[PDB]
Design a protein around this ligand. Structure first.
Ligand SMILES: O=C(CCc1ccccc1)N1CCC(O)(Cn2cnc3cc(Cl)ccc3c2=O)CC1
Ligand SMILES: O=C(CCc1ccccc1)N1CCC(O)(Cn2cnc3cc(Cl)ccc3c2=O)CC1
Lengths: 335, 334
């Protein structure tokens, strides 16, 4: 394979899958390498710990550990991962990286890669008043129940909700007014993170249940029809890059991530320390479900594929970062 | 029978339903005219779907030989059998029509796609044991009809607007309350002039193993009245439709044979478009012989046209409908 896996040092659940997905976001990895962490503390700095993990994944021939990384942002118990969905963990990592990039050239790199623009609108019917609420988004949670595939999920995602009964819109001064509620996509990020809503509740037993309904996702995803304004020369055509899967329908289950890091159709399976070649069928079709199925998908805009997946070489790692990390080994290599 | 005056599309490869869809849209004359008017002078030949569509339509109208679609497929992006098998026919039509509609913005043909294919529907989901109810309005350019256990298109529509119990799981995700048992209801506010109907013959067999094709018998009429399925019926424009084309598939699964039957003029004179081979056929071969065995060759999509809009939708198209700069550009490429 040529790629190195991550150690299983506890009940980190989806973390190892997320780290591999972000590590192969080459443009993000390069940005992480450029972070000025010379003065940061080794124990408390998430950006530094994140640099160490990416560095070891790129140079180490043995499984890479993540104890100091989890210890940096405080998720040191299985519970910590039970409290949050996968996207909320991705937010803690990206926000730690983005803050450290403030006051630099690479500032705003995370928003450029992951952030999208949408608007939540409420339009009155009898009277002329419209409330537009602009909101950035770094991920999209798709409803899969009764939905055949991503295409059908996006159609439902943009459905128009009606407010006309007792649930009339409180327009403040206008009081109660029949209105329509909806969401409109303004832009789609170069790297599209999609989460499938497979965790459900379930009031009778008062527990969260995973639904294993079949949900299909293509290798090529066209999303131009859902944008409010289309941009010629930059079509909203996306290419599948990673497939995060889970088995067991519980936090105590099995977590793995499938990736074609080069976006060339050559897929690999990342199962903790074991990285093995696999077919497109094992990575895609075998994860549609219908208890091992996909819960998160990563798509990359085709026009930005060369830039997002640009090759990262040793020259892209600052010497200061290398000297510090290698200095760290000498202390630990004292064994 | 072998000389019909119509040209076919070459069998480039595993484009699956593409050629059948293209012939469908080509004979939607009102749409074809709008495509000719799109301002494509500043378009890139290598990445412009609208220009590629103009090229295919132009060649289908003037060529004496099978027309190629490599430029269209190249610009579209789907160039593998695996790609088409991952998408339904309605998504291909949606991506194409939406791309052409964007191109028509700011022109005399702006909004042709929505006027011809866009209909509106309203649905509700009411929880049985919780005070949670959600009403929604939605635009649709196509309809997926269930055929399993359905005798004809009439029963399929009845099942479409029937109140379906959401029990089991199945259970409706009522946000804070759901999963919850609920009842779902859908109804048609309007029907578009051109009605695209997909028949759900490709279903996933769960172990079983993989998706299996449903060859059960499903009957569709030449004249389709859909007035009782609307929420409001108005005279002088009842929802009477005339079958315009029948997309059919033979074989099974990944490897299949695609054919489309069309009476382009809406006069009942049917023809069989089998890629480069086009030949006249009888109504029975286009309709009854596609109901499904009792086999391998049956319909998976139908195209009806509102009877009041028939003359307008199927308006005659002439060379004078093609701007000269478009003609000159295509003649230059040749
Ligand atoms: O690892 C787990 C717990 C076990 C699990 C794994 C995979 C699928 C279902 C359950 N999770 C991470 C992935 C996910 O976070 C996926 N996800 C994300 N956002 C959602 C938002 C809503 Cl509103 C409803 C469901 C989900 C959801 O399932 C669910 C919990
Ligand atoms: O060409 C193919 C694949 C081979 C094939 C062709 C015709 C009939 C069965 C299988 N397809 C295009 C037509 C279709 O896209 C029809 N269709 C459309 N929408 C559906 C929605 C649901 Cl929820 C379930 C089934 C279908 C469906 O079969 C199925 C795939």
């Amino acid at each position: 394979t040529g790629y190195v896996g991550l150690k299983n040092q506890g009940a980190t659940c989806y973390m190892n899958s997320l780290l591999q997905t972000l590590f192969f976001t080459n443009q993000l990895r390069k940005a992480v390498y450029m972070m000025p962490t010379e003065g940061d503390d080794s124990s408390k700095s998430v950006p530094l710990a994140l640099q160490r993990v990416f560095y070891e994944l790129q140079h180490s021939d043995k499984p890479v550990g993540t104890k100091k990384l989890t210890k940096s942002f405080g998720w040191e118990t299985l519970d910590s991962f039970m409290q949050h969905d996968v996207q909320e963990l991705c937010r803690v990592l990206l926000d730690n990286v983005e803050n450290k990039m403030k006051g630099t050239c690479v500032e705003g790199t995370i928003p450029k890669l992951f952030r999208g623009k949408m608007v939540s609108y409420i339009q009155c019917k009898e009277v002329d008043y419209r409330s537009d609420r602009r909101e950035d988004y770094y991920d999209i949670q798709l409803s899969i129940k009764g939905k055949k595939n991503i295409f059908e999920s996006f159609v439902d995602y943009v459905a128009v909700e009606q407010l006309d009964g007792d649930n009339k819109y409180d327009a403040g001064e206008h009081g109660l007014q029949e209105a329509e509620k909806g969401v409109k996509f303004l832009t789609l990020p170069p790297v599209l993170h999609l989460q499938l809503m497979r965790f459900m509740y379930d009031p009778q037993t008062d527990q969260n249940i995973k639904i294993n309904d079949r949900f299909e996702f293509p290798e090529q995803l066209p999303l131009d029809e859902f944008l409010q304004k289309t941009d010629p020369k930059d079509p909203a055509n996306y290419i599948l890059h990673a497939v995060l899967v889970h088995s067991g329908d519980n936090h105590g289950g099995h977590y793995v991530v499938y990736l074609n890091p080069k976006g060339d159709g050559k897929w690999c399976k990342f199962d903790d320390d074991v990285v093995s070649r696999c077919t497109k069928e094992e990575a895609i079709e075998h994860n549609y479900g219908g208890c091992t199925n996909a819960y998160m998908l990563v798509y990359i805009r085709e026009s930005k594929l060369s830039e997002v997946l640009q090759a990262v070489t040793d020259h892209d790692i600052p010497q200061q970062l290398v000297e510090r990390l290698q200095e760290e080994k000498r202390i630990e290599a004292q064994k």
